[PDB]
Write a structure and sequence with these properties.
This is part of a larger assembly, with chains A and B.
Chain A: H1 2-5, H2 10-37
Chain B: H1 4-12, H2 45-52, E1 73-77, E2 83-87, H3 90-101, H4 107-116, H5 118-128
Classes of the chains: A mainly alpha, B mainly alpha.
PDB class: transferase
Keywords: fungal, dehydratase, enoyl reductase, ketoacyl synthase, malonyl/palmitoyl transferase, multifunctional enzyme, acyl carrier protein, fatty acid synthesis, acetyl transferase, fatty acid synthase
Entry title: Crystal structure of fatty acid synthase complexed with nadp+ from thermomyces lanuginosus at 3.1 angstrom resolution.
Amino acid sequence: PKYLFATLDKAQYEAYCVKVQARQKKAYRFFHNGLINNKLFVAKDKAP
Amino acid sequence: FGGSEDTYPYLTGSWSTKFGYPPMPFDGCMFGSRMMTAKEAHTSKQAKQAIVDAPGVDDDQWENTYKRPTGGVITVLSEMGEPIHKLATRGVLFWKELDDKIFSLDRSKRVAELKKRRDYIIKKLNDDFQKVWFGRNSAGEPVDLEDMTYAEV
């Protein structure tokens, strides 16, 4: 991965890194909710 | 009651004459809402303050509590459901609110209706109710409890 990032400016890369760590926090939340409530898989009932 | 001038009538039995009845003397008078502002009572300063500030209403339109912020008091329901007269503060207003939209619905359908007005109820919770929304984050803004860090909690 590092090698891809070396395409960017510390400007860009660091902007991305903030996005990522926000996602991880959502993910973390979800995963724990799922484990407990058995909803790691959620079937979609209708198209968008 | 809040004085002897209005007390006197019933104390005599004169009130009852106004209704085409003999005099019906009361053996005494009882004071509740009145005494709340006694300096030796524990009512917080601004509390007994805002209390005074209630424009009373006559025996005429007390029935109006049930519907409007009549005077400074309004009627609102307990958790037991029982009716209560309170100073219609911003809180006691948003409390009447949920009485009519949330606590009005049967248990089941409630939780659903909460999720729909969530961020609304959460604002009015944060802004003007006795108990705030526990959802703050480090920065200061409100979030979901499920979104706070351990520290933050």
